[PDB]
Amino acid sequence: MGPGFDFAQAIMKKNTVIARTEKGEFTMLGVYDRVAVIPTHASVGEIIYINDVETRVLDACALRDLTDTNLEITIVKLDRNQKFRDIRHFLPRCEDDYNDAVLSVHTSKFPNMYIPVGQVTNYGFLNLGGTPTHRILMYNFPTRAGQCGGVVTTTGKVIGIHVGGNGAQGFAAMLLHSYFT
């Protein structure tokens, strides 16, 4: 509808796949090469379905900060026959707050879904499903089941992936350029 939704749509059309694990269907962001990200609660195994194609997982790493605290991001290398467009230059270098973000989801349940979530806070610490978690972004939208893995963008930046909510607020794990060197 405007330039925030334009950048979000460009990321969704070329840089997302539908990932299915034993824990459900997730929006999955491809970042570069055959490397993608998904929330750690997806419980990625040795095999994952990517747009309903059986796909070997070549590597999967659940990230933690140097406090040894959960970040809720898993980086997955996928045994695909195709690379993602390299979008690493749209990743923030630092922790920050943002205005006017969009959350975008694409699953069998929620295809072509875009939500203007507004102001994003560098929230930091969250007890997420009982697990101490760092680098959380927060927005004041009542996000629901089905939005985990959703991509959070501003104009020209891919800033996070949706990992949970409390009925009134939604929470995303930060994406940082340093995760993908």
Q: Are residues 176 and 151 in the same domain?
A: yes
Cβ atoms within 10 Å of 56's Cβ, excluding its own? 11
Closest C-alpha among 57, 12, 19 to residue 38: 19
CA 110 vs. chain centroid, Å, equals 15
Shared domain check, 30 and 64: yes
Q: Which sign, positive or negative, has the C-alpha torsion 134, 139, 140, 144?
A: negative
54 catalytically annotated? no
Question: Are residues 68 and 151 in contact, defined by beta-carbon separation less than 8 angstroms?
Answer: no
Catalytic site residue 148?
Answer: yes
User: How many domains in the chain?
Assistant: 2
- Same domain? 21 vs 11: no
Range of the domain at 143: 1-15+85-181
11 and 22: one domain? no
Does residue 62 share a domain with residue 100?
A: no
- 61: Cα separation from own chain's centroid: 15
| DSSP 8-state symbol, 84 | B
Q: Please tell me whether residues 121 and 139 are part of one structural domain.
A: yes
In the three-class reduction of DSSP (H, G, I as helix; E, B as strand; rest coil), residue 25 is classed as strand
Last residue of a domain, one of 84, 105, 128: 84
Residues 47, 25, single domain; the answer is: yes
Which resolution in angstroms does this entry have?
1.4
106 catalytic? Reply is: no
Does 166 lie in the same domain as 110? yes
Q: Which amino acid is at 83?
A: K
Distance between CA atoms of 13 and 17, rounded to whole angstroms?
9
Give the active site residue among 25, 134, 148, 162. 148
How far is Cα 63 from Cα 37, in angstroms, rounded to an integer? Answer: 10
Residues 92 and 147 in one domain: yes
Catalytic one of 72, 106, 134, 162: 72
- Are 69 and 32 contained in the same domain? yes
